[PDB]
Write an enzyme that holds these catalytic residues in place. Structure first.
Site, PDB file in Angstrom:
ATOM      1  CB  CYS A 146      -0.925  -0.015   1.217  1.00  0.00           C
ATOM      2  SG  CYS A 146      -1.847   1.504   1.488  1.00  0.00           S
TER       3      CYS A 146
ATOM      4  CB  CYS B 220       0.671   1.476   4.479  1.00  0.00           C
ATOM      5  SG  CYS B 220      -1.005   0.809   4.669  1.00  0.00           S
TER       6      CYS B 220
END
Ligand SMILES: [Mg+2]
Lengths: 105, 675
Positions: free
Chosen positions: A30, A33
């Site tokens: 991600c 993230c």
DNA sequence: GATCACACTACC
DNA sequence: GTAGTGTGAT
């Protein structure tokens, strides 16, 4: 300063802990993230003794996230007395995090 | 000769009313329309053509118009109407013979869009008429503000329907004339629109007569149906379903669920350089949201704070991608890939996968069992074409058969495909095959179950090969098949260790067995398989001679001709010079089996036996080289079996076959026992 | 160096 | 609904 949780240690490290615990559900694939990770590191050091920052990688620990209905990541869950106090989804900046915490603590 | 078409209120199974009909008479060159109350006059006109020794042309009349008229005449007029087979011509049957290299929508049951290749124009229009009519009807209704109900366009007669009926005959006539213009099947010196039925069949190529007899017989077979044990399959389905759930329970425990990107709108861009990052999962950027409203904002998003939308995925054993994902994580290194670059995940590969985690290694067997269980469930109960979805009120499954569906002259089967029921040697095959049987049909008078006669052509493929190589070996091979042992003869020709290796080897050349698959019979690969083939052929010169003779008639990739002449004279399209020999062999077998079932039924009828459930026997299924026949008594079953052998010998003699042809029959209650 | 039906996933 | 993959039969 950051606590690295596992599915098997979650109940004890988060649900039965004393004081506030900020849990970040993340994954290595991600982009967002990866953006907030650096931020959480500074937050753990700055709020120590006041807050405990923990991370749960949803790929190596697939059992926990579903119980909290994760639909996006990163997801920051603020726990208090084994209950989810607050929640925000997305790569917040240092300031948005600081104000999110200060406001909820 | 007359060309005709009718419109009725439903498919054959439930048709109850004649709406209209049109007849074009070549002798008067006039079109005549018959409305609902002209039904008796319509039938009279058709019988008048029969009285003159004439012919009646329909498009798909063998399967629909003809049997529908018999049904409707009895129901609406209490009249016995039975058009004789010899007086009917079917342009759909003719099209499938002459344009055998082309697919067709089988009167609209198939989406034209999904078929490969081109489609003959007139036949296309005829097959699309129902859909076009429905669109006009629907359009007209809505233009008037009233609701359209599925299928209502066929409930009542109307003039738009009558207009389509006329157009139908116009197009069928056009199609007919285009087909009769093919000099290979119809001698140019004869005007086939101006001859009696006897001249039509006798002066046209033999294949024309054979295809019409086959279509007439197979239409009857469809109407007979295959008696099916619904309760047995419903119980098999409970058993399979329970095993499926248990396997899933075990597999989901072993392979956990995970998260995957899902629903992301915008592309993730590097925050510092702004470089688009196409490979990262897609994100979403909240347009609204903050920490406060000060009152706290209990909304999950923050304006400008991006995130990656994700979904929870549970392990799905039917997903070959899930399988690949979990096995690689367990240490599996794929060696076989697909064109699209995906790892091959089939039963053979899975059988070879080795991972060191004991439980995950064992889970591979659970996965293979799961795939097989699902296969059975999909075919018998859950698939769109599942047996349980097709069994009719009469307790029979009426599968469709396109008598000349494949290029080689083989038939094709569908709805459901009764030529792909699991064999008794495969998992659950015995229960599947047992559910199809004459025993499941109770006699209409006595209530006693019928019995089954299963008859197959013995080693038809090798005998066809023997026939064609007789020109080169003077019957040596044919002599070995019927007197010695062809298998051990081929075993020596090749080098294979045992006799059974030779049987696998030989069938290999027939059913797409590649070199790797060949060498893999003695425990090796390509090389030991590429050498086995060459060795075999060097020790069987007649086969090599046959192959070169076949190609010299086709090639010089410039073609001399793109077709091979079949046993009945038809052109059989050859796709690849390499597939020429198999095309030749499969075609010979298909035509032999087709004439065989035709002659068998004719001899049974000549013996006084009646075809039908209200009679003595009923054809239930024809699966390439085998037929399953329901018989009222064991004595009839015996006659059918003996007659089929007589008919096969008649076929061999009819086409001067160089190899003696045989059959073997078995009597029993169902397909499991009559294998 | 064969013919063909059909299901199940993944994606639009 | 289409594309990709596989399995069911001869
Ligand atoms: Mg019609």
């Amino acid at each position: 300063k950051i606590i690295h949780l596992t599915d098997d240690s979650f109940d004890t490290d988060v649900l039965k802990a004393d004081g506030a615990i900020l849990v970040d559900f993340w994954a290595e694939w991600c982009g967002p993230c990866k953006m907030i990770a650096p931020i959480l590191d500074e937050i753990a050091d700055e709020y120590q003794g006041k807050l405990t920052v923990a991370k749960l990688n949803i790929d190596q620990n697939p059992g926990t996230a579903p119980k909290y209905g994760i639909r996006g990541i990163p997801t920051l869950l603020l726990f208090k007395n084994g209950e989810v106090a607050a929640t925000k989804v997305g790569a917040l900046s240092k300031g948005q995090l600081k104000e999110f915490l200060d406001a909820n603590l | 000769m007359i060309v005709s078409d009718i419109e009725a209120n439903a498919l054959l199974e439930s048709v109850t009313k004649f709406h209209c009909g049109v007849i074009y008479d070549y002798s008067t060159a006039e079109y005549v329309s018959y409305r609902p109350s002209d039904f008796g006059a319509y039938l009279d006109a058709l019988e008048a053509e029969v009285a003159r020794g004439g012919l009646i042309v329909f498009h798909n009349g063998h399967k629909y118009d003809v049997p529908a008229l018999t049904k409707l005449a009895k129901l609406q007029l209490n009249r016995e109407f039975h058009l004789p087979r010899e007086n009917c011509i079917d342009t759909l049957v003719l099209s499938r013979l002459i344009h055998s290299n082309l697919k067709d929508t089988d009167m609209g049951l198939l989406r034209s869009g999904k078929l490969p290749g081109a489609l003959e124009a007139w036949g296309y229009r005829l097959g699309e008429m129902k859909g076009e009519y429905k669109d006009d009807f629907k359009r007209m209704l809505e233009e008037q503000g009233e609701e359209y109900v599925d299928g209502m366009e066929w409930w009542n007669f109307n003039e738009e329907m009558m207009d389509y009926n006329v157009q139908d005959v116009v197009v069928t006539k056009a199609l007919l004339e285009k087909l009769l213009s093919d000099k290979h099947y119809f001698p140019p010196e004869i005007d086939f629109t101006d001859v009696g039925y006897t001249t039509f069949w006798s002066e046209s190529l033999e294949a024309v007569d054979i295809e019409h007899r086959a279509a007439w017989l197979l239409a009857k077979q469809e109407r007979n149906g295959f008696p099916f044990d619904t309760k047995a399959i419903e119980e098999l389905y409970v058993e399979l379903a329970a095993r499926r759930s248990e396997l899933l329970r075990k597999l989901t425990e072993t392979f956990g669920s995970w998260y995957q990107p899902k629903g992301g709108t915008e592309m993730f861009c590097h925050p510092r350089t702004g470089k688009p990052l196409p490979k990262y999962p897609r994100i979403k950027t909240p347009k609204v949201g903050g920490i406060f409203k000060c009152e706290l904002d209990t909304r999950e998003y923050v304006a400008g704070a991006p995130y990656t939308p994700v979904e929870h995925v549970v392990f799905n054993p039917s997903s070959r991608d899930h399988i690949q994902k979990k096995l690689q994580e367990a240490g599996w290194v794929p060696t076989k890939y697909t064109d699209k670059g995906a790892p091959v995940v089939d039963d053979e590969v899975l059988e070879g996968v080795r991972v060191d985690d004991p439980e995950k290694q064992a889970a591979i067997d659970l996965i293979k069992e799961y795939l097989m269980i699902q296969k059975r469930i999909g075919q018998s109960a859950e698939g769109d074409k599942a047996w349980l979805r097709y069994v009719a009120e009469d307790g029979k499954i009426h599968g469709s058969v396109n008598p000349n569906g494949a290029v080689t002259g083989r038939a094709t089967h569908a709805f459901p495909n009764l030529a792909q029921i699991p064999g008794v040697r495969s998992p659950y095959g015995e229960q599947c095959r047992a559910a199809f049987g004459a025993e499941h049909h109770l006699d209409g008078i006595t209530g006693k179950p019928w019995v089954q006669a299963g008859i197959d052509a013995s080693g038809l493929e090798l005998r066809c090969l023997a026939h064609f190589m007789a020109r080169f070996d003077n019957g040596e091979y044919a002599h070995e098949i019927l007197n010695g042992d062809i298998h051990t003869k081929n075993q020596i020709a090749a080098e294979l260790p045992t006799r059974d290796n030779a049987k696998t080897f030989i069938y290999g050349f027939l059913y797409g067995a590649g070199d790797e698959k060949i060498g893999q019979i003695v425990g090796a690969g390509k090389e030991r398989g590429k050498e086995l083939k060459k060795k075999f052929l060097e020790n069987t010169p007649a086969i090599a001679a046959l192959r070169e003779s076949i190609q010299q008639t086709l090639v010089e990739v410039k073609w001399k001709r793109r077709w091979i002449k079949g046993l009945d004279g038809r052109k059989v399209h050859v796709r690849s010079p390499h597939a020429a020999l198999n095309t030749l062999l499969q075609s010979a077998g298909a035509l032999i089996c087709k004439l065989w079932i035709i002659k068998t039924e004719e001899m049974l009828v000549e013996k006084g036996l009646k075809h039908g459930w209200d009679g003595d026997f009923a054809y239930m299924a024809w699966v390439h080289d085998e037929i399953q026949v329901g018989c009222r008594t064991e004595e009839i079953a015996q006659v059918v079996i003996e007659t089929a052998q007589e008919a096969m010998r008649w076929v061999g003699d009819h086409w001067n076959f160089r190899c003696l042809l045989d059959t073997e029959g078995k009597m029993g209650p169902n397909w499991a026992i009559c294998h």
